[PDB]
Structures are given as C-alpha cells and as structure tokens.
C-alpha cells in the first residue's frame, strides 16, 4: 500500500511479553487496547481508546494527547502526567508510559 511511516513507536519487552514496533503515519494514530487501533496494545491495564498521536508533518513535533485513560499517560525524563485532551509535543526518543507500559517514540 501507499502510506509511508513518518515515525515509530517502540513498545519495550518485559513481564507482559516481547517487544513490538508500530509505524506512525500522518494524521491521527490511536493508541489503545482495541484491535482496530493504529497502535494496538492488547493488555488489561490499557484503555480501549487510551491516547492519540497526531502527526501533521514529517518534520513537525507530533501531538500526544491522553484520551481520558484510566491508568494515565505519562512522559519521563522529566516526569509529566498528561491531562486528558491536552496537547503534549513529542520530541525524538521521548519515553512514554501508557498505563504501566514503557514506550519510546522515534522520528524517521
């Protein structure tokens, strides 16, 4: 197909199982437990619709928003707890927690 990834979300391996890599595309990339999510994370602590990474351009910082998750979305180095709907701009190599799951965003 035609869509070209403009980013990558890495889900670290751990107690929940092996690592995963998800391509991120222009527009809205939904993170959640639903199999239809752009970034599907089939784990009990992840909300059905957990967060959204919106990418407007390959060379502009994405927008991360929590979608009213139960267990939260957080940014590390330094710690930051995201309020539902509020824009957070992602930097290259950003470490993100969706609930208890550690992830890392990469520019391509």
């Amino acid at each position: 197909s035609n869509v070209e990834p403009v980013g990558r979300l890495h889900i670290f391996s751990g107690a929940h199982g092996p690592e995963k890599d998800f391509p991120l595309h222009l527009g809205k990339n939904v993170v959640g437990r639903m199999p239809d999510c752009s970034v599907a994370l089939p784990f009990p602590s992840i909300s059905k619709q957990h967060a959204e990474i919106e990418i407007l351009a390959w060379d502009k910082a994405p927008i991360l928003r929590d979608c009213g998750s139960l267990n939260g979305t957080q940014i590390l180095r330094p710690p930051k707890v995201l309020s539902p709907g509020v824009s957070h701009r992602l930097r290259d190599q950003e470490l993100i927690l969706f609930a208890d799951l550690l992830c890392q965003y990469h520019r391509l």
Binding site: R33, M34, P44, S45, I46, S47, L70
Partner: peptide, 8 residues
C-alpha cells in the same frame, strides 16, 4: 471488550 483494569 472488558473494562480497563485499574492499577492496584
């Protein structure tokens, strides 16, 4: 799908 499980 079932409800999200709170971290306890």
């Amino acid at each position: 799908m079932e409800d999200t499980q709170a971290i306890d």
